[PDB]
Structure formats: C-alpha cells, structure tokens
Amino acid sequence: ESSFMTLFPKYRERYLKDCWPLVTKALEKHGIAATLDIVEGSMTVKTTRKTYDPAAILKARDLIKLLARSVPAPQALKILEDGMACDIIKIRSMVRNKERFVKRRQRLLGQNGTTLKALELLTQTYILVHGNTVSVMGGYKGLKEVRRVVEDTMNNIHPIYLIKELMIKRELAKDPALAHEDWSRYL
Amino acid sequence: TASDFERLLLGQPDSSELWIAYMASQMQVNDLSSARQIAERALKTINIREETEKLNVWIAYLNLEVAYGTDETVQEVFKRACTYNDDREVHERLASIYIQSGKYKEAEDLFEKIVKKYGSEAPHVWYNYAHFLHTKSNKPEQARALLKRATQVLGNTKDTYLYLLPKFAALEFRSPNGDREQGRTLFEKLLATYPKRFDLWNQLLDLETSASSVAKNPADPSVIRDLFERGTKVKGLRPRQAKAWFRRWAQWEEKFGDAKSREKVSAKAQEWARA
Amino acid sequence: EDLYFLIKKAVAVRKHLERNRKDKDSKFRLILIESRIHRLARYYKTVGV
Amino acid sequence: LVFGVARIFASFNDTFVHVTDLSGRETICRVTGGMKVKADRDESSPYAAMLAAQDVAARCKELGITALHIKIRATGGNGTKTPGPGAQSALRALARSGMKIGRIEDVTPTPSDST
RNA sequence: GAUUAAUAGGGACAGUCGGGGGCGUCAGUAUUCAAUUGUCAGAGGUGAAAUUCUUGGAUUUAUUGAAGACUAACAACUGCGAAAGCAUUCGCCAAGGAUGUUUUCAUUAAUCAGGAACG
Structure with a gap:
C-alpha cells in the first residue's frame, strides 16, 4: 500500500465523476484501487497486494496527474500503454512579454x-x-521532437519551417541508402 | 569665530566646505556635541540637490565617529548614511577611512562585508581589497584566492572578467609584495584565452615598459624585446596597430639607448610592411 | 490652504527624491505636482495673492 | 527483511540503475545502458534496461538485500520531469526478477528558478 | 458690501486597496565552481553520429563551502502602474486608486502649435 495524490478543481470535478467508472474499472483491470473525494x-490511489505489474503505481500517478491536467478520459486512459508517457512544457517563464506570449501561443495553435x-x-x-x-x-522520440518544436515556436521561428523540417526528417529517415550523415544540407 | 562662521553660513548655506570648517573649529574647541549639532544642521539646511555637499558632511562625520567617537555611534551613522545616500560609496569611504586610520582588522571585516553585499556588481571593491592585500596585510596568496572568489561572484562577460583580471594583474605589477611574475601569469592567461585582443596586448606592453619591478623600479629589456616579438608574430594585426606597436618599440629602445635594437626595429618594421 | 497642502506634499516628494534620486516614477510624481503648483499658484496669484 | 535504496536515472538517450546503501553513501552496484547493449542509439532501450536490471538484481540478491525502496528521477534541471522507458522496464524487470518492495518514491530535483 | 454650491473642480481627514515604485532585510530551489567519500567502464550527444570527458575515476551516490540567477505548482476572460511593465518573508520611504465625511478658495475648467520626463 503506497499512495499518490493531488488536487483537482470543481470545474474538472463534474467530468471526473462522469468519466470515473471507466477510470476505476481500468485501474481494476490493472489491479489497483482508486477513490475520489x-x-x-x-483522488487517492493505493497499490493493492494483487497488483501483478510493478509500474502500475507510477503510471497511475501520471494518469491522475493528467486527469488533473484536464485531458479527455480516452487519451487519459491511453496513457496505460507501455510506451505512452506524458511531458510538460511551461512557456510563461520562457516568454517574458504578455502580448507576445499570447501571439506566440496563438501562432502555436495555428x-x-x-x-x-x-x-x-x-x-x-x-x-x-492549457x-x-x-x-x-x-x-519518446515524438516527445523529444515536439519539445524541440514548442521551444522553437516560443523562439519565433515559424511552424511552417518546423513542419518542413519534420517532413524532411521523415523522408530522409525512410530512405535507407542515406541512413547516416548530418543532413542539415537538406534542411 | 562662531559669529563669523554663522555670517558666512547665512551668506552660503549649501557650502559644505565652510560647514566642515565650522565644525572643525568645533573640533579645535573640542565641543564634539556642537560639532554633531553643526553636522546635522548641514544635513538639514544644505539643499536637496547638493549630493556632493551632503556626502562631504557625511564622510566628515564618519571621520569624527572613527577618530573621537565609538563603535555604536559609527555604526548608527553608517546605517543612516547608507539609508540616505549610496551604500556602496559610503562603505568605500569608510573603508578608505579605515585604511587611513590604520584600523585594519575592522577594515578587513568591512571589506568582507562589502564584497559580500556589493561584490555582485562592483569590480572596484575587489580591486581596492586586493590593493589592501598586496599592501599592508601582505597576503598575495589571499589576494589571488579572493580573485578566484571574484571570478565566482561575477559573470563571465567581457568587462567584468577581462577587466578585473588585468586590473588585478596591474596591482601585481605595481605592488612589490605583488610579484609582477604573477602579473605576467595573469596576463599570459589573458592573452591565451583571448589572443585577438590587441588592446589588452597593448596594455600588457604599457605595463612592462612602465615600472614593473617596483622593488627597484626599472623595466626589463629582455622580456620587453621578447613580448614585442610575440606581438609581431601574433595573427590578426591591422597595419595601423602594427605601425603603432613598431613606434612604441622604437620609443622604448630610444629610452633604453640601444641603437642596435633601434635599427633592428626599423628593419623589422620594413620587412613587416613588405607584404 | 490647498496650495499649502500641495507644496507640503511637494517638499515631501522632493526630500524622498533626495533620499533616492533613482526613483523615476517618483520624479514623474514630482513633475505632476509641480505642474499643479504652477497652475494653481498662477490662478490664485491672479486674485491678488 | 533487509532494505536498500535503488536509485534510477533513466533519460531518453541513456539509463542508469545505481543501487547505493540505505543512507545513500556506499555504492553497492552500478551498471548502465552501455555496460548493457552498448549501442549508442539503443543505449536507452527497455531491453538494455532489462539486462541492467537483471545484473543489479543478481548482484544485490548475491549480497542478500532482497527488498528495495526505489528512488526515481530524470533530467530535472532544464529538460523534462518525466523519466524513461528504461525506468519503466527496469521497475518491471526488478519486481519480476522477484524481490519485494515496500514504498516507492520518485524524487526529482525541481527548480524554482529555471529561467 | 460675499448667488445657485456644479449631476466639472482640487484639497483635507478616516477605514481601506494595490504581483505600483525605490531601498534595505528573510527564504526557496536549481545551475556552475571547489572539497570529501562510495565509485569503477563507459559517459555524452544525436534521427543515426561525431567533438568532448573518461583507471588521476568521468557519468553516477551522498555531504558541505562559495557564487550568480530567478521565484514554479497557486497564477486568473484577474489586480496595480500612464507606458515599458509588475509575482519569496519582513521592514521602511514617500506617492497612487476607490469608498465615505456633519470638509473647504468658488472658476479655478477642457483641448493641444512651441517645448519637456520616462523605452
């Protein structure tokens, strides 16, 4: 028995209740109990003794953290995959200007x-x-890459440049004869 | 007399030099309480914008509290003087006051206080403290240790880094307890990490052609010639700076008296201009 | 008087600018209070004071 | 029921398993992804982590500890707060190599300063 | 000899408000540098790599010493400042907003050519 816990707000609480039986039955499948205050x-998780897999507690902690992060329930249970994991990028500390922050986050939206x-x-x-x-x-490769993407967007080089880079990454990784050089000549 | 002083004060109320003259007459008549009375009269009636006259009255009163006063009054006037003036400047004035009065232990405590409080932005505080160290406390190892401390406290921008390193090196060159050999160490490290910095090369050249061994006050013509050769061989020289360095070499060899080295300088300037 | 209280607030902000001449927003408060001083001193010097 | 501290530093380009004593001063064992598969791309791989986890599990059971309380971290300075697939597969491989665990706590050096 | 007291003024006082300013004070981490140990074969990057550091021990583990930097999560369809902008405890120095008053000189008002302060 080892617990993880954090705190959600009331505007999230309604959806957490009306999506929770999905969540608690998936954690029942993972062998871990969970309750809501x-x-x-x-939300209070606790590793039962019938937890067949060890990583259940850590993945449940990231799960409940993303439920707090107000992500939808199907993707929030898609986190239960072996290679699926989250990440956070705070950008208010990276952009000092408020209107420039709003403009660059809208430029990130597109x-x-x-x-x-x-x-x-x-x-x-x-x-x-959020x-x-x-x-x-x-x-994880997509994660490293999209973290690079969001810091370049807050650095104000445009996402159309970035997407051009990624499609070149994609095709130059798909062809096998060119497999290992520094391909910045093509970027 | 006091009536004469009051007449000249009603003539010129902002005049700090006359204020200190009046309270100095009060020192000569030993009435330190009326001297305090006069000093605070200056602090009130000297007008708002006259910061230099205010700080003159301030530093004079600090001289009083260190000379005839005590610890509690000097610390409360230190607090009030930094409350109403610039902390760094009143701290440096009390430091130079301690240097003059010989109270070197509490001087050291003030120095560590001001390198803690204002070593973050002032390079000059580390300069003055290394000056104290290569002077009367006579700990050059402590001076270079606090130089390493300064490189810790500061950033690594050009002004702070590449200005405290040559100012410390100049202190090494100018103090007989400072070892111009360690100054040459600092300058060699400077021109190693930045060999493109010909103004710093020039400043090393000035420092060697000036009074390097202050223990007996010549320069050293051998290493003068060798460093001048290295200044010729270093890449990146614009022809204006090259001609200026050749002129400086010629001037020093005229000061030396070696016409053979003079004509060597002329011939090497010719073959350098050949390009 | 109103002008008396205005010039009182003015010498207060002047002595604080003496305490620290680096406070530029307070210097801006000085320029507004001196503009008000000029205006109302002229407008009540016109009446005879 | 002996206890110990198994520290894990799993990035996305390398993975660490580094068991130290219960105080955290005497390093018992340490093995890496390059002491594992030694392929500079698969140096952070779940498979290399399985190999590393079996190595440390065998050596710590040889010293006879048989119970751990795992500390988990990542590049908490500037990069992500999220640890690696090496950490995932390593915890799975550890408690499927068999030792029992009490509590697990992931301690990661959060900055209140970053930039 | 001196009007309405203005549903325009400004001030005064009282309770307030402000991640408003300036200055000093108290922390918080994290980064770097230094030391100490346990180390003991890579580490570190990358899409793959290379450079680089690596039996003097890197990377790692822990404990200190120093340093500067900023103040996460709270943190907002908010708040303050004219604007740049503004987020640690505490304290001071003045100022500013709103409220109320059983507070006053009674046109003092509004606008900007010239010009001037802050980026």
Missing part, C-alpha cells in the same frame, strides 16, 4: 488547429494547450 477534491494536427500526425503524438502549460503524449 468530493468535499475536498482529491489556423483552426491544422498546425497542431499536422504536428500530431507527423510525430504520432497528442497535444493539449494556457501557460503544454501537455503532450506519445512515443
């Missing part, structure tokens, strides 16, 4: 989300935009 707003969807498919990743914080998921 209502008068205070905490027109109607086509840019974030292009990034999602180019890295097989997931993106959420103000000053960047929740992301997927394979």
Whole structure:
C-alpha cells in the first residue's frame, strides 16, 4: 500500500465523476484501487497486494496527474500503454512579454488547429494547450521532437519551417541508402 | 569665530566646505556635541540637490565617529548614511577611512562585508581589497584566492572578467609584495584565452615598459624585446596597430639607448610592411 | 490652504527624491505636482495673492 | 527483511540503475545502458534496461538485500520531469526478477528558478 | 458690501486597496565552481553520429563551502502602474486608486502649435 495524490478543481470535478467508472474499472483491470473525494477534491490511489505489474503505481500517478491536467478520459486512459508517457512544457517563464506570449501561443495553435494536427500526425503524438502549460503524449522520440518544436515556436521561428523540417526528417529517415550523415544540407 | 562662521553660513548655506570648517573649529574647541549639532544642521539646511555637499558632511562625520567617537555611534551613522545616500560609496569611504586610520582588522571585516553585499556588481571593491592585500596585510596568496572568489561572484562577460583580471594583474605589477611574475601569469592567461585582443596586448606592453619591478623600479629589456616579438608574430594585426606597436618599440629602445635594437626595429618594421 | 497642502506634499516628494534620486516614477510624481503648483499658484496669484 | 535504496536515472538517450546503501553513501552496484547493449542509439532501450536490471538484481540478491525502496528521477534541471522507458522496464524487470518492495518514491530535483 | 454650491473642480481627514515604485532585510530551489567519500567502464550527444570527458575515476551516490540567477505548482476572460511593465518573508520611504465625511478658495475648467520626463 503506497499512495499518490493531488488536487483537482470543481470545474474538472463534474467530468471526473462522469468519466470515473471507466477510470476505476481500468485501474481494476490493472489491479489497483482508486477513490475520489468530493468535499475536498482529491483522488487517492493505493497499490493493492494483487497488483501483478510493478509500474502500475507510477503510471497511475501520471494518469491522475493528467486527469488533473484536464485531458479527455480516452487519451487519459491511453496513457496505460507501455510506451505512452506524458511531458510538460511551461512557456510563461520562457516568454517574458504578455502580448507576445499570447501571439506566440496563438501562432502555436495555428489556423483552426491544422498546425497542431499536422504536428500530431507527423510525430504520432497528442497535444493539449492549457494556457501557460503544454501537455503532450506519445512515443519518446515524438516527445523529444515536439519539445524541440514548442521551444522553437516560443523562439519565433515559424511552424511552417518546423513542419518542413519534420517532413524532411521523415523522408530522409525512410530512405535507407542515406541512413547516416548530418543532413542539415537538406534542411 | 562662531559669529563669523554663522555670517558666512547665512551668506552660503549649501557650502559644505565652510560647514566642515565650522565644525572643525568645533573640533579645535573640542565641543564634539556642537560639532554633531553643526553636522546635522548641514544635513538639514544644505539643499536637496547638493549630493556632493551632503556626502562631504557625511564622510566628515564618519571621520569624527572613527577618530573621537565609538563603535555604536559609527555604526548608527553608517546605517543612516547608507539609508540616505549610496551604500556602496559610503562603505568605500569608510573603508578608505579605515585604511587611513590604520584600523585594519575592522577594515578587513568591512571589506568582507562589502564584497559580500556589493561584490555582485562592483569590480572596484575587489580591486581596492586586493590593493589592501598586496599592501599592508601582505597576503598575495589571499589576494589571488579572493580573485578566484571574484571570478565566482561575477559573470563571465567581457568587462567584468577581462577587466578585473588585468586590473588585478596591474596591482601585481605595481605592488612589490605583488610579484609582477604573477602579473605576467595573469596576463599570459589573458592573452591565451583571448589572443585577438590587441588592446589588452597593448596594455600588457604599457605595463612592462612602465615600472614593473617596483622593488627597484626599472623595466626589463629582455622580456620587453621578447613580448614585442610575440606581438609581431601574433595573427590578426591591422597595419595601423602594427605601425603603432613598431613606434612604441622604437620609443622604448630610444629610452633604453640601444641603437642596435633601434635599427633592428626599423628593419623589422620594413620587412613587416613588405607584404 | 490647498496650495499649502500641495507644496507640503511637494517638499515631501522632493526630500524622498533626495533620499533616492533613482526613483523615476517618483520624479514623474514630482513633475505632476509641480505642474499643479504652477497652475494653481498662477490662478490664485491672479486674485491678488 | 533487509532494505536498500535503488536509485534510477533513466533519460531518453541513456539509463542508469545505481543501487547505493540505505543512507545513500556506499555504492553497492552500478551498471548502465552501455555496460548493457552498448549501442549508442539503443543505449536507452527497455531491453538494455532489462539486462541492467537483471545484473543489479543478481548482484544485490548475491549480497542478500532482497527488498528495495526505489528512488526515481530524470533530467530535472532544464529538460523534462518525466523519466524513461528504461525506468519503466527496469521497475518491471526488478519486481519480476522477484524481490519485494515496500514504498516507492520518485524524487526529482525541481527548480524554482529555471529561467 | 460675499448667488445657485456644479449631476466639472482640487484639497483635507478616516477605514481601506494595490504581483505600483525605490531601498534595505528573510527564504526557496536549481545551475556552475571547489572539497570529501562510495565509485569503477563507459559517459555524452544525436534521427543515426561525431567533438568532448573518461583507471588521476568521468557519468553516477551522498555531504558541505562559495557564487550568480530567478521565484514554479497557486497564477486568473484577474489586480496595480500612464507606458515599458509588475509575482519569496519582513521592514521602511514617500506617492497612487476607490469608498465615505456633519470638509473647504468658488472658476479655478477642457483641448493641444512651441517645448519637456520616462523605452
């Protein structure tokens, strides 16, 4: 018995209740009990002795942290995969200017989300935009790459440049005769 | 007399030099309480914008509290003087005051206090403290240790790094307890980490052609000639700076008296200009 | 008087600028209070004071 | 029931398993991804981590500790707070090589300063 | 001899408010540098790599010493400052906003050519 816990707000609480039986039955499948508090707003996990897999506690901790990060329940249970993991990128500390912060976060969004969807498919990743914080998921290579992407966006080189780079990364990694050089001549 | 002083004060109220003259007459008549009275009269009636006259009254009163006062009054006036003036400057004035009065132990405590408080932005505090160290405390190893401490406290920008390193080296060259050999160490390290910095090369050249061994006050013509050769062989020289260095070499060899080295300088300037 | 309280607030902000001449927002407060002093001193010197 | 401290530093380009004493001063064992598979791309691999985990598990059971309380961290200075697939597969491989665990605590050096 | 007291003024006082300013004070980490130990074969990068550090022990583990930097999560469809901008404890120095008053000189008002302070 070893617990992890954090605190959610009330505007998240409603969706946490109405998506929770999915969550607690998936944690029942992973052999770990979980409860929700209502008068205070905490979720309490606890490793039972019938936990067949050891990483259940850490992945449940990241799971409940992303539930706090207000991500949707299907992706929040898609975290249960072997290679699936999260990451955070705080960008309010990186951008000192408020209007420039708003402009560059909107530039990260792009027109109607086509840019974030292009990034999602180019890295097989997931993106959420929670103000000053960047929740992301997927394979570790995609994760390293999208962290590079968000710091370049806050550095104000444009995502169309970045997507051009990633498609070149993709095709130059798919052809096998060119497999190992510094290909910055093509970038 | 005091009436004469009051007449000249109603003539010129902002005049700090007359203020210190009046309280100095009060020192000569030993009424240190009325001297305090006069000093605070200056601190009130000297006008708002006259910062130099205010600090003159301030540092004079600090001289009083170190000379005839005691620890509690000198610390409270130190607090008030930094409260109403610049902390770094009143601290440096009390430091030079301690240097003058010989109270070198509490001087050292003030020095460690000011390198703690204001070593973050002042390079000059480390300069003055190394000056104290190569002077009367006579610990050059402590001076270079506090130089390493300075490289810890500061950033590594050009001004702070490449200005405290040559100012410390100049102190090494100018103090007989400072070992111009260690100054040459510092300068060699400077021109190793930045060999493109010909103004720093020039400053080394000035420092060797000036009074390097202050224990007996010549320069050293052998290493003068060798460093001048290295200044000729270092890459990156614009022809203006090259001509200036050849002129400086010629001037020093005229000061030396060796016409053979003079004509060597002329011939090597010719073959350098041949390009 | 109103001018008396204005010039009182003015000499207070002047002596604080003496305490630290680096406070430029306080210097801006000085320029606004001196503009008000000029205006109301002229407007009540016109009446005879 | 002897206890110990198994520290884990699993990045995305290398993975560390470094068991120290219960106080954390006497390093018992340490093995890496290059002391594992030694392929500079697969140096942070779940498989290299399985190999490393079996190596440390065998040596610590040879010293006879048989129970751990795992500390877990990552590049907490500037990069991510999230540890590696090496850490995932290493915890799985450890408690499937068989020793029992009490509590696990992931301690990661969070900065309140970063930039 | 002296009007309405203005649903325009400014001030005064009282309770307030402010991640407003300036200055000193108290922390918090984390980074670097130094030391000490346990180390004991790589570490470190990258899409793959290389450079680099590595039996004098790197990377790692822990404990200190020094340093500068900024103040996470709270943190906002907010708040303050005219603007740049503004987020640790405490304290001071003045100023500023709103509220109220059983507070006053009664046009003092508004606008900007010239010009001037802060980036």
